[PDB]
Amino acid sequence: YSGRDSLIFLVDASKAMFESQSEDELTPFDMSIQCIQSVYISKIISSDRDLLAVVFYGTEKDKNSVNFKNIYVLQELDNPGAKRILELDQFKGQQGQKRFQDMMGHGSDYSLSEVLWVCANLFSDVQFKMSHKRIMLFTNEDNPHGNDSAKASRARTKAGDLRDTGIFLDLMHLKKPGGFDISLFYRDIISIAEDEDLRVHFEESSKLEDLLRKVRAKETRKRALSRLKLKLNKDIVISVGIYNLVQKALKPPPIKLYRETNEPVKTKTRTFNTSTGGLLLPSDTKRSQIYGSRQIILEKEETEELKRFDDPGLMLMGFKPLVLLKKHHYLRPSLFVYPEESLVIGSSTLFSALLIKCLEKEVAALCRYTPRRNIPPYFVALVPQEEELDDQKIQVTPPGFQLVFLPFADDKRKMPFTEKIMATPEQVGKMKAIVEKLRFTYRSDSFENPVLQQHFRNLEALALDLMEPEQAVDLTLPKVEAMNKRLGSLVDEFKELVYPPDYNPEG
Amino acid sequence: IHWPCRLTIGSNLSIRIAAYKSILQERVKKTWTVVDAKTLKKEDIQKETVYCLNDDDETEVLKEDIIQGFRYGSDIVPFSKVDEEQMKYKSEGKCFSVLGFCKSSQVQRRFFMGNQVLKVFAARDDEAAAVALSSLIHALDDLDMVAIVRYAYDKRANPQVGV
Amino acid sequence: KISNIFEDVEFCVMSGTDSQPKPDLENRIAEFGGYIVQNPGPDTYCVIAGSENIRVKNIILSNKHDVVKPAWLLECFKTKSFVPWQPRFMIHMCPSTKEHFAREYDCYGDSYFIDTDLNQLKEVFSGIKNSNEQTPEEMASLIADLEYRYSWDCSPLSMFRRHTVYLDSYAVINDLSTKNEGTRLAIKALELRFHGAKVVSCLAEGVSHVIIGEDHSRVADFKAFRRTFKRKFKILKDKCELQEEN
DNA sequence: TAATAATAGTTTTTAGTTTATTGGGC
DNA sequence: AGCTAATAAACTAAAAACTATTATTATG
């Protein structure tokens, strides 16, 4: 865990945010609010347990507790909800903006120091462990608070103060026809870990394209599967963390709730004497398995100890070259092992030495693995995956041992096999050409389950109670027309090459 | 048992195929039956589940009187089953198609999902399909490519992808 | 409470999102004692639908309940009593309700035992889309049947659109692909559109009406064509052109 | 006279049960 | 022209991890 995330959005309640160079372009307030909607939807599906708030500045009215003028808070730091989405969308649009300007003011003098006070106080309100005091704001101009030198000085003083307090903030470039005026008033006063300010950005060219994009995932935090241990012989033991860099996600379980109250009704379940109508007890339980006629009775710890073979841990078997593993031999999704000094101190040194040595030897680690108590231990192989970096020196692959599992004899399922049949080499060349026609470079993040996407689409659609639900796009459908036009007549050429001209492959 | 299907390529190629689960995880097929502690019978043993009111009450809620729902951020959306079943993703029945081709080294063993290994041949009594698959095997071996394929067990299963 | 009739009957108040929001409408329903249920049950008589929702779309799909617009319930509350279920708040309904409406009403809002008025007839007519795909001769025949059968021969306007008159509108005969200007043919062509008495501009054996147009020089052509038929052309003695059918 | 040390309180996977499930049959 | 079996999916309980706190003893 080690902290949580929270963002607060700041919108200039002025008239510059309520115009457009051309009607094809929305107002700054318009694309800001729609990007806010997209961000909130993403947070709900991704990390709904975070904190989000909305505050406005420059408006005529105000709502902050300290009651600084022009400082109207809209929403406080809370887990996002569809109600907030509705509150935002009631003013999102070419007329909802007018509704907002009617029921709410816009355009007045203020001090950025005041909004910084308000946001700092809002930070003070939250109490859970917190890690990312990210602040987001939206405008296309900087100099209005540089107009008053005293206002500029106090604003930059408070900005330095909040930077000292660990607060991090980010601004979106908005389309100002005369240029946002980078480097004039903000990047010297705002918090940046890097400098790319080169163009005063007459347009809104910054990272809205990423933010408006909707993501659909869960992004489970880095949680150690176990600090399980490797028993070398009987006493040489090291502490290593267990991880799964891939973990099959699935649709969240439903919650059974009422009809007219919609309340999730608790469901107590028990067992009673059917022959009597009385009541039975968990102690009054006996499991049976009848093979033919004889009935055999087993109990709780009776069924437990049959699963008992050894203590949960890793028991080294030996070493074998990596090549001696058949690729088609697969059991289930692989695991990953990372060292740790939390329990066994110096175990990281041993892990590094083993990784380097076995990488030199090109050998695999054979070991007996017991996940937890009362489980049959299974043999596994630890292939050393070296940490690989990129042009950005980011870990495209972390260091450690990828944990692949070794199937047993029962796993092997033989099938009715046939003889070996060969093919003419010219047909093989035709296949090579046809493959080259439709070849491409695979990338892992280029594909996704459309079924869960459609599930989400429906979920937020009924949440947003529109006329129609959003339609997900299947990225797993082949481009049949594109592939066919890309191949040409080679398809039918090989069809007559191999398949009989009179007999189609269809029966 | 085989999986009698037809691998589809584009809109003009189809090969009758039979898939065998070459690797299957061992698992007992004999469940444990709770019988009485005195009569050693399951006849006097069966569950009693009660949907007693979660609120300040204890009234059981009937099966039809209770529906499902799903957590949505800070709230839970009421949900039926007819709604989802008429707005679920509709898979196109039992099918299996190829999607693309890439180098074998483009993928690693650490991205192998599922719990079974499928060894697939053509359907029985199609020797032309046998020659076609043999040519496919030879060409794939020579080029060292790997075929990206889309799987779908049937209408009621979840379509997915594979290599 | 206000009216016990609205009580004892379950109502699926699920879309009160109208100009009047949901909560105040539900409060008024409670004030009348109307039974409120969030999800549509078998005992629920009808489902309350205001604005449209995807849930409402599924309700349309679920042929189990009757979709009710807020107008009907608002009028019920104003009248303190149930408003008859004529289709103007209706979207989707049970097959039992389908038979009920087919009994108490026709295939439209017209009733079988309640005399029609301006409002219901106008609503029925405006509800149906434009359906002009038949031939103009079919129009003429059907309107003539309506006039003669129903003693409807009281139309103030009848020149040339509707039934049974003849009049030449072209100086050149048997060649109607060209129009002659600088004469009164254009005026007659204009008159042959609006008021109504079927247009005939071709010479055949099926004409028995003797009419002289606005041009007095066409009488020579009329007499030339008179010998071709058995009919004899007679000198002509509202129509505002001084024509006689005899 | 008063600080520290095993402890349960949440998720979170995960590993058995349950079910409605197309094919042949003749 | 009548007949039904593996089965992934769903549904459970169950077990661990990972925080978050505290009944205890020196000790005056």
Coordinates of C-alpha atoms (C1' of nucleotides) in Angstrom, one line a residue, chain B residues 21 68 81 153 156-160, chain E residues 5-13:
Chain B
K21 CA -6.5 -31.4 -24.5
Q68 CA -28.5 -9.2 -7.9
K81 CA -30.4 -11.1 -14.9
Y153 CA -15.7 -22.8 -27.2
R156 CA -22.3 -19.8 -23.8
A157 CA -18.5 -19.7 -23.2
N158 CA -16.2 -16.7 -23.2
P159 CA -14.3 -16.1 -26.5
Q160 CA -10.6 -15.5 -25.9
Chain E
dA5 C1' -22.9 -35.8 -21.3
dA6 C1' -18.5 -33.3 -20.5
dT7 C1' -18.1 -28.2 -18.9
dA8 C1' -16.6 -23.7 -18.6
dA9 C1' -19.0 -20.6 -15.6
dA10 C1' -20.6 -19.6 -11.6
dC11 C1' -20.8 -20.1 -6.9
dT12 C1' -19.4 -21.1 -2.8
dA13 C1' -16.3 -21.5 1.4

